Amino acid sequence: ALSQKVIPPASPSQASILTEEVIRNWPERSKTLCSDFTALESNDEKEDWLRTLFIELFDFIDVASFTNELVNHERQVSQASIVGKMFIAVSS
């Protein structure tokens, strides 16, 4: 009698819009994502997108994801700073 604890409202899994589609078509989709990331300018905006992707990723959880993070970080080493690593370090 502390509370009804009955919840009429509900939400379905239509999220992961930027990490969209099945994980199937894995390598094509993964290369597409890496290319899209390398494409973006205005580093700030990049950070924003990253957040979404990363939280979407932690919705699923694996070795494929680790390889994807390897590719992302290695692509980011070309530049000076390391944003992907810091953002994983927080969003973990």
Binding site: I7, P8, P9, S11, R51, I55, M86, F87, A89, V90
Partner: protein, 97 residues
């Protein structure tokens, strides 16, 4: 985030948005735990607010690390480096001698 002072300012702006979200979440929580209909609308507003608080927090911790890095990068600059550009060495040497 180029300077220690500028990064601290960005962190302050990130604190404020989190605070407003937290205060709104708390009031909705009070309405839900208050001794239906109003409680039903609140029980949905609470997930609506949730799709916001974690994202805002995310940003606060990110900036905390950002600020820590800049402070360390600034602290590496020793006194000699700053006085490289003094316009007139001469007078300095005469005065010291």
């Amino acid at each position: 985030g180029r300077t220690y002072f500028e990064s601290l300012c960005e962190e302050e702006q990130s604190l404020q948005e989190s605070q407003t979200h937290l205060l709104n979440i708390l009031d909705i929580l009070s309405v839900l735990a208050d001794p239906d209909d109003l409680l039903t609308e609140s029980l949905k507003k609470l997930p609506d607010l949730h799709r916001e608080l974690i994202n805002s927090s995310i940003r606060l911790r990110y900036d905390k690390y950002q600020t820590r890095e800049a402070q360390l990068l600034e602290d590496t600059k020793t006194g000699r480096d700053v006085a490289a550009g003094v316009q007139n060495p001469k007078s300095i040497s005469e005065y010291y001698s």
